[PDB]
Amino acid sequence: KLQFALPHETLYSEVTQVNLPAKSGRIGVLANHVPTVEQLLPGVVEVMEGSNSKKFFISGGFATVQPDSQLCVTAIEAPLESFSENIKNLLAEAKKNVSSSREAAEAAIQVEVLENLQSV
Amino acid sequence: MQLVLAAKYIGAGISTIGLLGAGIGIAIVFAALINGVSRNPSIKDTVFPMAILGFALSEATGLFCLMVSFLLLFG
Amino acid sequence: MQLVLAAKYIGAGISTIGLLGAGIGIAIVFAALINGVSRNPSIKDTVFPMAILGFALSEATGLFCLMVSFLLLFG
Amino acid sequence: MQLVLAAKYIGAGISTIGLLGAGIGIAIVFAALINGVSRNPSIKDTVFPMAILGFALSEATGLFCLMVSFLLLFG
Amino acid sequence: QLVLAAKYIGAGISTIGLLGAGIGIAIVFAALINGVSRNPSIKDTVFPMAILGFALSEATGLFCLMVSFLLLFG
Amino acid sequence: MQLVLAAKYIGAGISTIGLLGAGIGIAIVFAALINGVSRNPSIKDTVFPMAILGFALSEATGLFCLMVSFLLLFG
Amino acid sequence: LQSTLDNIQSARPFDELTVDDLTKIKPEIDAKVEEMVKKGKWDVPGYKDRFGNLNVM
Amino acid sequence: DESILLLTFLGFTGLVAKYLAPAYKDFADARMKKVSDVLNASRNKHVEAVKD
Amino acid sequence: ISYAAYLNVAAQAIRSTELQTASVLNRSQTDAFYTQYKNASEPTPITK
Amino acid sequence: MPQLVPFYFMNQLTYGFLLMITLLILFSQFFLPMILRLYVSRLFISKL
Amino acid sequence: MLKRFPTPILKVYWPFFVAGAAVYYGMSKAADLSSNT
Amino acid sequence: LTTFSLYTIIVLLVITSLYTLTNNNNKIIGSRWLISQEAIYDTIMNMTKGQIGGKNWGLYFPMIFTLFMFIFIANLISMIPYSFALSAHLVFIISLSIVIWLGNTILGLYKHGWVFFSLFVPAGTPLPLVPLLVIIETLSYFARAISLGLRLGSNILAGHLLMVILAGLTFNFMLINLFTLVFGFVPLAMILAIMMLEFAIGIIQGYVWAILTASYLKDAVYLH
């Protein structure tokens, strides 16, 4: 059972399969999966409760299967549909920004976000 | 001829060496099963058909080796 | 002639050894399959055809040893 | 003469042993692919050219071995 | 006669050396595939080095093969 | 006479086996290089000269072995 | 402009046509190809962004 | 010997027509369409400009 | 930079389709002024 | 193998290298630019 | 259909052609050496 | 006349058909068969733009293309159950490999002087083992001469020979006892899988040839 909670939403609180992109590659959870902590990287996420499947765009967070089979996912914001080319225009600007210059790291994060955006 | 009869028995022995590889192979499949199922304890029912297949194929390479042994032994 | 005929029966046994490599090989592909499927759950649709291909290519190397064995044994 | 012809067939058997190495090798390249995919399926299209490249290169050493065998056997 | 036979036997034994190179090649390519699957992005730096490593791993096997040809033909 | 001449050629074949380990050795160095660089994205400047040293030492055992092979073969 | 509309209406080979016929009405076609052979590339800039990349990967 | 090899080749060409030929038709068709659509789209594109 | 700063920047970026609500956008902007103190003695209040 | 040791090596190799020079020119001057004609034409049509 | 385009691979590819000529001479001699093996 | 000479003619006639009876009408859409020769063009364009990636990538693209197409076609010839490859005359393939290697060595020597030998200095390392690292770079550089050739030659030849040996054996299966006469199709199917594999490794070999002599050319044009 997925507990998907956000500081302004909580779309899940049983969720059968969840496929997650983590700093360990991709992890899939099906029923009892090993009770772990995994840092969620910025992601394109699928949550399936039964066969019904919900596509989520995830801003990174943490995933933690609890030993009581509660897959606590915490992330800052969520659906995949919300992602939809102005972001590409902003990312072009962000590429420019790294040339001059926290801003260096930020623009690097923007390149990461560009990858995450491309994933959609 | 003593030399020929000997040669059959020698060649048979040599054939037997090949079998070691298959033995190790079977274990490798089973090791993966244990770790895998531990890693997701619910995958088992899907995986168990796959496991018997992988066993059989690794074993089969061994069978072909053992056949060449039996051919030298009995013909 | 007894020497050459003895060479066939012995030489066949020597060739049989090569099969061992393929035998371990089959297992390595299937072990990878079992581990991978346990990680993702759902990757399996893609990976299962790849697993069969990997087994076949490893198996083929084993078969090459077997045909050399038969060149000496029968031939 | 018989010693020479014997030596061709014995020498042939001995060479065949080299093939086992390639059989394990092929499996290893594919195992890396399978593990890579299960851990990240988005990388796959970039990786596929490298996978095929590694398969061929790995296989080639086993085929070099097999050619020495055929040079002895047929030649 | 015996000398001719002997070089044919010696040729058989030398061929076995190739085995190690074959395993070697697979280890380089496996590591490439694992590294690239982890990074999505390491590949540009890594791929030239991987071909160098391949060449060297195979090359040891080619030394084995060259001794084999000196026996077999020579 | 004939036995000694034979023993040079055969002895050379036997010696050639040792080279195989160095082949695997070089690969292990390059694998580790690949792994390290993939972990850091940035260790490489320290690690690359270090790696060339590692390559040279692993190779060297093979070169000593090859030297003896040539002494038997040509000598 | 009326004539221009008629001109596209009376000529628009959008289902196929020999590249030679396009060379005949515009010898710039053959010129650009030639300039690319001369330059030392077999790339066509912008071709890839609205026609295939036709590669394994 | 080689007549067995000719049987193998006959089976091989049969498999090609079985599996590959409809797939390669669909692939070829798909690509053919894409080229056509871009070409005709651009013809349309300048026609719009004339009207403007 | 800090991991949660990384996630923060990502979250802010992630609020770009542009069709998203004001509350997200408000959650993606801040005007707060980071006053800085020490031992009372104040380094100049750089914007948060 | 005896069947792969003729002494006709240079005879064979003469016919072989003639084929290489022929195909190289044939591709390079004729057939490669004939693909490049399709590409450039497609792009020119794409532009207009 | 066919339209020729001159490609300067006949004066950029000079070390490739040079290697071919040397090997041609050596292979003539190699054929002779194998016909008198 | 000469079988080898005859097979050089067959290869030329196949290749002409790929831009004549495949390139049908010189369409701006491209014929369904001709879509293949667009894809080959682009995947080798993007490969040697990858590998060498100079301004001379396209300048060495015709040679890398006819080395592709040669191997690609000659492993169609090798699929014919009575026609025997040009590549199976190993002396042509190995000779071609050494020739291409020599034309790289000369190009490198010419282009980069006697500091061409700085290619054989790999990296900064302790000075008493710097000369060692020149020796086992030049050895590996002239390993490139034969490695490429022996790779292709062995694969194609061994494949055709493998098929012939199993075909002859499956002939002799019908001549041993009647339980083997039954299930005479089951070994034939094993040969079908191999025939598929020999086709595959032949297409793989054309790419592998053309990438390996792109890697060597990467080293030669830009030292390292």
CSV table of N, CA and C in Angstrom, one decimal, chain I:
chain,number,residue,atom,x,y,z
I,1,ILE,N,26.1,21.6,-3.9
I,1,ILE,CA,25.0,22.2,-3.1
I,1,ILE,C,24.2,21.1,-2.4
I,2,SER,N,23.5,21.5,-1.4
I,2,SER,CA,22.7,20.6,-0.6
I,2,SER,C,21.7,19.9,-1.4
I,3,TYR,N,21.4,18.6,-1.0
I,3,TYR,CA,20.5,17.7,-1.6
I,3,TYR,C,19.1,18.2,-1.7
I,4,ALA,N,18.7,18.9,-0.6
I,4,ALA,CA,17.3,19.4,-0.5
I,4,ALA,C,17.2,20.7,-1.3
I,5,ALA,N,18.4,21.4,-1.5
I,5,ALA,CA,18.4,22.6,-2.3
I,5,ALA,C,18.3,22.1,-3.7
I,6,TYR,N,18.9,21.0,-4.1
I,6,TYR,CA,18.8,20.4,-5.4
I,6,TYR,C,17.4,20.0,-5.7
I,7,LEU,N,16.7,19.3,-4.8
I,7,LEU,CA,15.3,19.0,-4.9
I,7,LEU,C,14.4,20.2,-5.0
I,8,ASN,N,14.8,21.3,-4.2
I,8,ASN,CA,14.0,22.5,-4.2
I,8,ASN,C,14.0,23.2,-5.5
I,9,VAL,N,15.2,23.4,-6.2
I,9,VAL,CA,15.4,23.9,-7.5
I,9,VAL,C,14.7,23.2,-8.5
I,10,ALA,N,14.7,21.8,-8.4
I,10,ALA,CA,14.0,21.0,-9.3
I,10,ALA,C,12.5,21.1,-9.2
I,11,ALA,N,12.0,21.3,-7.9
I,11,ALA,CA,10.5,21.5,-7.7
I,11,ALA,C,10.1,22.7,-8.3
I,12,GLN,N,10.9,23.8,-8.1
I,12,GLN,CA,10.6,25.1,-8.7
I,12,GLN,C,10.5,25.1,-10.2
I,13,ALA,N,11.5,24.4,-10.8
I,13,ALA,CA,11.5,24.2,-12.2
I,13,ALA,C,10.4,23.4,-12.8
I,14,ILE,N,9.9,22.4,-12.0
I,14,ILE,CA,8.9,21.4,-12.3
I,14,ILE,C,7.5,22.0,-12.4
I,15,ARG,N,7.3,23.2,-11.8
I,15,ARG,CA,6.0,23.9,-12.0
I,15,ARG,C,5.8,24.5,-13.4
I,16,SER,N,6.9,24.5,-14.3
I,16,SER,CA,6.7,24.7,-15.7
I,16,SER,C,6.5,23.4,-16.4
I,17,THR,N,4.0,22.2,-18.5
I,17,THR,CA,3.1,23.2,-19.0
I,17,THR,C,3.0,24.4,-18.1
I,18,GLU,N,2.6,25.6,-18.7
I,18,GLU,CA,2.5,26.8,-17.9
I,18,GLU,C,1.1,26.9,-17.3
I,19,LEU,N,0.3,25.9,-17.4
I,19,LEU,CA,-1.2,26.0,-17.2
I,19,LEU,C,-1.5,25.8,-15.7
I,20,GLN,N,-0.5,25.8,-14.8
I,20,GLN,CA,-0.6,25.4,-13.5
I,20,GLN,C,-1.1,26.5,-12.6
I,21,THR,N,-1.6,26.2,-11.5
I,21,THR,CA,-2.4,27.1,-10.6
I,21,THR,C,-1.4,28.0,-9.8
I,22,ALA,N,-2.0,29.1,-9.2
I,22,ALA,CA,-1.3,30.1,-8.6
I,22,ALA,C,-0.6,29.6,-7.3
I,23,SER,N,-1.3,28.7,-6.5
I,23,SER,CA,-0.7,28.2,-5.3
I,23,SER,C,0.6,27.5,-5.5
I,24,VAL,N,0.7,26.7,-6.5
I,24,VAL,CA,2.0,26.1,-6.9
I,24,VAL,C,3.0,27.2,-7.2
I,25,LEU,N,2.7,28.2,-8.0
I,25,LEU,CA,3.5,29.3,-8.4
I,25,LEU,C,3.9,30.1,-7.2
I,26,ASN,N,3.1,30.2,-6.1
I,26,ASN,CA,3.3,30.9,-4.9
I,26,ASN,C,4.3,30.1,-4.1
I,27,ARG,N,4.1,28.8,-4.1
I,27,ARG,CA,5.0,27.8,-3.6
I,27,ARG,C,6.3,27.7,-4.3
I,28,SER,N,6.4,28.4,-5.5
I,28,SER,CA,7.6,28.4,-6.3
I,28,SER,C,8.2,29.8,-6.3
I,29,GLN,N,7.9,30.7,-5.3
I,29,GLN,CA,8.5,32.0,-5.2
I,29,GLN,C,8.5,32.3,-3.7
I,30,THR,N,9.4,33.2,-3.3
I,30,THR,CA,9.5,33.6,-2.0
I,30,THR,C,10.2,35.0,-2.0
I,31,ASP,N,9.8,35.9,-1.1
I,31,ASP,CA,10.3,37.2,-1.0
I,31,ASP,C,10.9,37.5,0.3
I,32,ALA,N,11.0,36.4,1.2
I,32,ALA,CA,11.5,36.5,2.6
I,32,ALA,C,12.9,37.0,2.6
I,33,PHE,N,13.3,37.7,3.7
I,33,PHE,CA,14.6,38.4,3.8
I,33,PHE,C,15.3,37.6,4.9
I,34,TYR,N,16.4,37.0,4.5
I,34,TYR,CA,17.3,36.2,5.4
I,34,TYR,C,18.2,37.1,6.2
I,35,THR,N,17.7,37.5,7.4
I,35,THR,CA,18.5,38.3,8.3
I,35,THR,C,19.6,37.3,8.8
I,36,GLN,N,20.8,37.9,9.2
I,36,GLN,CA,21.9,37.1,9.6
I,36,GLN,C,22.3,37.7,10.9
I,37,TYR,N,22.6,36.9,11.9
I,37,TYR,CA,22.9,37.4,13.3
I,37,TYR,C,24.2,36.6,13.6
I,38,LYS,N,24.7,36.7,14.8
I,38,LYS,CA,25.9,36.0,15.3
I,38,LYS,C,26.4,36.7,16.5
I,39,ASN,N,26.5,35.9,17.6
I,39,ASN,CA,27.0,36.3,18.9
I,39,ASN,C,26.5,37.6,19.5
I,40,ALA,N,23.8,38.1,17.9
I,40,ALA,CA,23.4,39.5,18.1
I,40,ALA,C,24.0,40.4,17.0
I,41,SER,N,25.3,40.4,16.8
I,41,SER,CA,25.9,41.2,15.7
I,41,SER,C,25.5,40.6,14.4
I,42,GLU,N,25.0,41.5,13.5
I,42,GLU,CA,24.3,41.1,12.4
I,42,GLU,C,25.0,41.3,11.1
I,43,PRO,N,25.4,40.3,10.4
I,43,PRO,CA,25.7,40.4,8.9
I,43,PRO,C,24.4,40.8,8.2
I,44,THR,N,24.6,41.5,7.1
I,44,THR,CA,23.5,42.3,6.5
I,44,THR,C,22.4,41.3,6.0
I,45,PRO,N,21.1,41.6,6.2
I,45,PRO,CA,20.1,40.7,5.8
I,45,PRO,C,19.9,40.4,4.3
I,46,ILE,N,20.7,39.4,3.8
I,46,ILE,CA,20.7,39.1,2.4
I,46,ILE,C,19.3,38.4,2.2
I,47,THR,N,18.7,38.6,1.0
I,47,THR,CA,17.4,38.1,0.7
I,47,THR,C,17.5,36.6,0.7
I,48,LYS,N,16.4,36.0,1.2
I,48,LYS,CA,16.3,34.5,1.3
I,48,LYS,C,16.1,34.0,-0.1
